[PDB]
C-alpha cells in the first residue's frame, strides 16, 4: 500500500516513533518519503549484492535475511520478505533497532541526503494526528 503523508505520520506516532531516541516524528515521515515514497512494497537491489526492503528500505546485508546476500548478519532476526506488509509493525520494530546503533538515522542514505538539515517538522504539519 501507498501511505498518504498524514496517514503515515499518524501511524508512525501510534507506533512510537515520535521522539524515539532523540528523533522527532518528521524525520521518520521524511525518511519514508525519500526511501520508498511511502510504498510498503518498495524493494531495491544494491551494488554490493544486498537488497533494501519496505517502507523504510531495510537492508539485507545487516538487518534482514533474503538468503542471497553475501556476509549477512540478520540483526533484526527476520526474513526480508516479512517487511513488505501493509502493516508497518515489523518495519518499525526493526527500524528502532537500526537507529539504536551509533549511526542513528544516518543509516538511511535518502534521509541523510534529503531530510537531515531540513525542516522535517514540515512533514507532519497540517495533519490530524
Amino acid at each position, epitope marked *: 500500500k501507498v501511505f498518504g503523508r498524514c496517514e503515515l505520520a499518524a501511524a508512525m506516532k501510534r507506533h512510537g516513533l515520535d521522539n*524515539y531516541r*532523540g528523533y522527532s516524528l518528521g524525520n521518520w515521515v521524511c525518511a519514508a518519503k525519500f526511501e520508498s515514497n511511502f510504498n510498503t512494497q518498495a524493494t531495491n537491489r544494491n551494488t554490493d549484492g544486498s537488497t533494501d526492503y519496505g517502507i523504510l528500505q531495510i537492508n539485507s546485508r545487516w538487518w534482514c535475511n533474503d538468503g542471497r546476500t553475501p556476509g549477512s548478519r540478520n540483526l533484526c532476526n527476520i526474513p526480508c520478505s516479512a517487511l513488505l506488509s501493509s502493516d508497518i509493525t515489523a518495519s518499525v520494530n526493526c527500524a528502532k533497532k537500526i537507529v539504536s546503533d551509533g549511526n542513528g538515522m544516518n543509516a538511511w542514505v535518502a534521509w541523510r541526503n534529503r531530510c537531515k538539515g531540513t525542516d522535517v517538522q514540515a512533514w507532519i504539519r497540517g495533519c490530524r494526528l
Partner: antibody, heavy 113, light 107 residues
Framework: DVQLQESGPSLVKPSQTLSLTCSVT????????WSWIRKFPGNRLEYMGY???????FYNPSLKSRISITRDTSKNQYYLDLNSVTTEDTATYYC???????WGQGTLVTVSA | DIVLTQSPATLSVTPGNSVSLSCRAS??????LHWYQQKSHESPRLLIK???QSISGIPSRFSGSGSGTDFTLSINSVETEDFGMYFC?????????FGGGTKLEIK
C-alpha cells in the same frame, strides 16, 4: 539455539575494577546487540549499557563513566568492566541481548573490604 | 531520565481472578514500554514488547495496553505460576529505565 552465561569473581574489594564475562552459545555475537543489567537489593533494576553489532557503546550516566563494555568475537564473548567499585555496586549482574529474549543466569557480586 | 512508576507496589490475589498492573512514565514514550516477569533465583523474562505486542512462548493470558504515559499489564485468570515480580522498562530514550516493580502474590 542461543544461551548466555555470566562468569567472573563473586567477591571484590572496594576501589578495584569489577569484571564479568558473558559467554554466548548458539550463534555469533556479531549477530546481535548485547547488554548488561544489574539488580540491587530491594528489587531495583538498573540498565547498565549495551554494545551494538558495529561496536557502538551506550552507558547509563548513573555509572559516572566507570563502565566499559567490550567484545571478543573469536571467543564469542563480551565483557563488563566497572572501575572504582564501592559497596553500592553489590548486586546481581545479568547479561542479555538487547531485545530481552535471551538472558544469562545472573551472578551475584559482593563488594566488601 | 524517564521515571517509571508502578502501582500498586504489591497485589495479593486468589488464583482464577483477573488483574491489571500499572506503569506510568514521567514523559510520553509512545509505545516503547516492555513488560518483564521475574521469579526468585531466576532472570527476568520478557512478557510483552512495545506496550502490546505478544511474545511467542508466553501464556496468552498475558496482554498489555496503553500509550503515551499510561500502560497496563493485564493477566486473565491468574495462575499460581504467575506469582512473582513484574517490571516495566522503557526504551524510548537513553538511558533505558525500569519501573520499581509490582509484586504479585497469592491472597
Amino acid at each position: 539455539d542461543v544461551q548466555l552465561q555470566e562468569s567472573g569473581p563473586s567477591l571484590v574489594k572496594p576501589s578495584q575494577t569489577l569484571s564479568l564475562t558473558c559467554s554466548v552459545t548458539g550463534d555469533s555475537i556479531t549477530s546481535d546487540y548485547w547488554s548488561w543489567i544489574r539488580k540491587f537489593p530491594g528489587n531495583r533494576l538498573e540498565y547498565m549499557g549495551y554494545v551494538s553489532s558495529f561496536g557502538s557503546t551506550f552507558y547509563n550516566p548513573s555509572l559516572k563513566s566507570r563502565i566499559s563494555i567490550t567484545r571478543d568475537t573469536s571467543k564469542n564473548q563480551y565483557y563488563l568492566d566497572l572501575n572504582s567499585v564501592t559497596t553500592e555496586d553489590t548486586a546481581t549482574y545479568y547479561c542479555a541481548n538487547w531485545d530481552g529474549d535471551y538472558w544469562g543466569q545472573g551472578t551475584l557480586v559482593t563488594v566488601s573490604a | 531520565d524517564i521515571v517509571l512508576t508502578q502501582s500498586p507496589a504489591t497485589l495479593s490475589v486468589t488464583p482464577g481472578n483477573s488483574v491489571s498492573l500499572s506503569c506510568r512514565a514521567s514523559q510520553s514514550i509512545g509505545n516503547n514500554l516492555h513488560w518483564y516477569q521475574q521469579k526468585s533465583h531466576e532472570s527476568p523474562r520478557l512478557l510483552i514488547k512495545y506496550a502490546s505486542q505478544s511474545i511467542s512462548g508466553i501464556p496468552s493470558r498475558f496482554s498489555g495496553s496503553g500509550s503515551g504515559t499510561d500502560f497496563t499489564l493485564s493477566i486473565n485468570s491468574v495462575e499460581t505460576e504467575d506469582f512473582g515480580m513484574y517490571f516495566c522498562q522503557q526504551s524510548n530514550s537513553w538511558p533505558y529505565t525500569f519501573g520499581g516493580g509490582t509484586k504479585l502474590e497469592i491472597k
